[PDB]
Design an enzyme around this catalytic site. Structure first.
Site: not given
Ligand SMILES: C=CC(=O)N1CCN(CCCn2c(=O)c(-c3c(Cl)c(OC)cc(OC)c3Cl)cc3cnc(NC)nc32)CC1
Length: 298
Positions: A23, A157, A161-162, A175
């Site tokens: 999301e 947070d 889930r994070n 995140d």
């Molecule tokens: C906040 C509301 C929400 O509803 N949600 C949905 C769940 N959640 C998706 C996980 C998808 N996801 C990310 O967002 C990232 C990722 C991360 Cl953690 C970052 O932290 C610094 C930074 C970043 O860009 C800068 C990326 Cl793109 C890395 C990542 C690696 N792997 C996977 N596989 C599922 N998924 C990721 C994102 C938050």
């Protein structure tokens, strides 16, 4: 427009964007990258890419740029989601990070809960999850948080889930560089997943809007409960209204079933009212390490 950072800049044409990963509050996409390792220019790798939403304000842009720069400064660690590259020149802003194949820790645990199942094979009552691996998961999240703390980074947070799980079951804190606007939090708002983020907040954070690393320790304590409930939702059957008064009365979660007193002790330690009376992440890493090495090695 944006300044060129040759250290991190990656050619956008070497990206092949794919299916979404979740999301977000920008759009996250699983992408294929070629030559991420410059020694192997034609080698494919699976990465995650964050971009801006369709019709994004200047704030959404500033937020992602801010998130991009935070990840540059924090540096690399095996137990966090690491920055791989960015695309700032001649096209939309891309932020490229590591991809976690198995998704977030909560879903990982819930999808791997133990079996009235009809017994086949020699190990029918033997689930995918064992006690030492559960401890390992906790240990890794702890070590990851320790690194972030050393980089003066407060998550605000921390939850199962994070936390993201790789193909080799490595925990990576997700995140951690988000600007989550802690002055306008809807404590009653339930997410799409059904989660109430207020249940992970330290009292000083919830009541006094005060965040420290000890605030994250409280959250980690909640995460510990999540692990050994195999993805259970904290404070079961308690609406936010009741949670407010319960926390004011000093209410704490009961000891979950199939959970040794050593670990419930750590949970309760993380939930000590006085932040200074909570363990540090360094102490948590050390404590969890002792339990991890105490496993029976045959
Ligand atoms: C906040 C509301 C929400 O509803 N949600 C949905 C769940 N959640 C998706 C996980 C998808 N996801 C990310 O967002 C990232 C990722 C991360 Cl953690 C970052 O932290 C610094 C930074 C970043 O860009 C800068 C990326 Cl793109 C890395 C990542 C690696 N792997 C996977 N596989 C599922 N998924 C990721 C994102 C938050």
């Amino acid at each position: 427009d944006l300044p060129l950072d040759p250290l991190w800049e990656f050619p956008r044409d070497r990206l092949v964007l794919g299916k979404p990963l979740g999301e977000g509050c920008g759009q996250v996409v699983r992408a294929e990258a070629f030559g991420m390792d410059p020694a192997r220019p034609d080698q494919a790798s699976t990465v995650a890419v964050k971009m801006l939403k369709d019709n994004a304000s200047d704030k959404d842009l500033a937020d992602l740029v801010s998130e991009m720069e935070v990840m540059k400064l924090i540096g690399r660690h095996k137990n966090i989601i690491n920055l791989l590259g960015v695309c700032t020149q001649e096209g939309p802003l891309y932020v490229i990070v590591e991809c976690a194949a198995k998704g977030n820790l909560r879903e990982f645990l819930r999808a791997r809960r133990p079996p009235d199942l009809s017994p086949d094979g020699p190990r029918s009552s033997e689930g995918p999850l064992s006690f030492p691996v559960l401890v390992s998961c906790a240990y890794q999240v702890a070590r990851g948080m320790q690194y972030l703390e050393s980089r003066k980074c407060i998550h605000r947070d921390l939850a199962a889930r994070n936390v993201l799980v790789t193909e080799d079951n490595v925990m990576k804190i997700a995140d951690f560089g988000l600007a989550r606007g802690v002055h306008h939090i809807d404590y009653y708002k339930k997410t799409s997943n059904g989660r109430l983020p207020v249940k992970w907040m330290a009292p000083e954070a919830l009541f006094d809007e005060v965040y420290t690393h000890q605030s994250d320790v409280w959250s980690f304590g909640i995460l510990l409960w999540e692990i050994f409930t195999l993805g259970g939702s904290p404070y079961p059957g308690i609406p936010v209204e009741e949670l407010f008064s319960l926390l004011r009365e000093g209410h704490r979660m009961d000891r979950p079933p199939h959970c040794p007193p050593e670990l419930y002790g750590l949970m309760r330690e993380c939930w000590h009212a006085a932040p200074s009376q909570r363990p540090t992440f360094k102490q948590l890493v050390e404590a969890l390490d002792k339990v991890l090495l105490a496993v029976s090695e045959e």
